[PDB]
Amino acid sequence: VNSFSGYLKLTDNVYIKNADIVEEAKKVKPTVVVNAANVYLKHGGGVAGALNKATNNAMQVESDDYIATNGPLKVGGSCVLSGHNLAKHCLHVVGPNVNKGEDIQLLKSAYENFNQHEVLLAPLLSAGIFGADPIHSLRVCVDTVRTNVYLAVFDKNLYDKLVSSFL
Ligand SMILES: O[C@@]1(CNc2ncnc3[nH]ccc23)CO[C@H]2C[C@@H]1C2
Numbered sequence: 001v002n003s004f005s006g007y008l009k010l011t012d013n014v015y016i017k018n019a020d021i022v023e024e025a026k027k028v029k030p031t032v033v034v035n036a037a038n039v040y041l042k043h044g045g046g047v048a049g050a051l052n053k054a055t056n057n058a059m060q061v062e063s064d065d066y067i068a069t070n071g072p073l074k075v076g077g078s079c080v081l082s083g084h085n086l087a088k089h090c091l092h093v094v095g096p097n098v099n100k101g102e103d104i105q106l107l108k109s110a111y112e113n114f115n116q117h118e119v120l121l122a123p124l125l126s127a128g129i130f131g132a133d134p135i136h137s138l139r140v141c142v143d144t145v146r147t148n149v150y151l152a153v154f155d156k157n158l159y160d161k162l163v164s165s166f167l
């Protein structure tokens with residue numbers, strides 16, 4: 001039993017809710033919140049820009065030190081950093097950004113990072129400003145993640161389409 005509330009159960013381990021991941025994180029304080037990161041951990045917009053703003057830019061400061069030490073992530077890769085005031089940990093995961101021409105096949109690799117964590121609050125990878133089809137992202141999520149994932153979908157119209165089209 002965990003403290004996530006109001007989610008529709010898609011599968012044994014995947015749950016979905018129309019919610020602002022920032023507000024969800026501030027309520028639940030999950031062990032792990034997933035960020036829709038880019039390889040540079042430049043949290044300018046989308047989910048990343050919103051999560052960073054909620055940390056008063058502390059996420060960006062920590063991220064810049066991480067990059068200065070380790071260099072960029074790989075597309076499909078991840079790193080674990082602090083969750084600041086939002087969660088214990090933030091798993092920064094880089095899905096392919098279609099608006100950059102990155103291979104959508106890397107989306108499965110991106111979701112595989114979730115399997116290293118028993119429970120996660122997460123957005124759909126590569127959705128929104130990363131330019132992938134969110135229906136496809138949900139399908140890859142369900143077919144790849146085996147741990148318990150609670151998906152927050154900000155757009156209510158998108159949330160309804162994801163549920164009504166789910167196979
Ligand atoms: O859910 C999407 C990804 N962006 C987010 N998801 C959850 N909480 C969020 N908080 C801020 C941004 C944000 C996927 O497609 C459309 C609907 C949005 C963009």
Ligand SMILES: [Cl-]
Nearest residue numbers: 046047128129
């Ligand atoms: Cl977005």
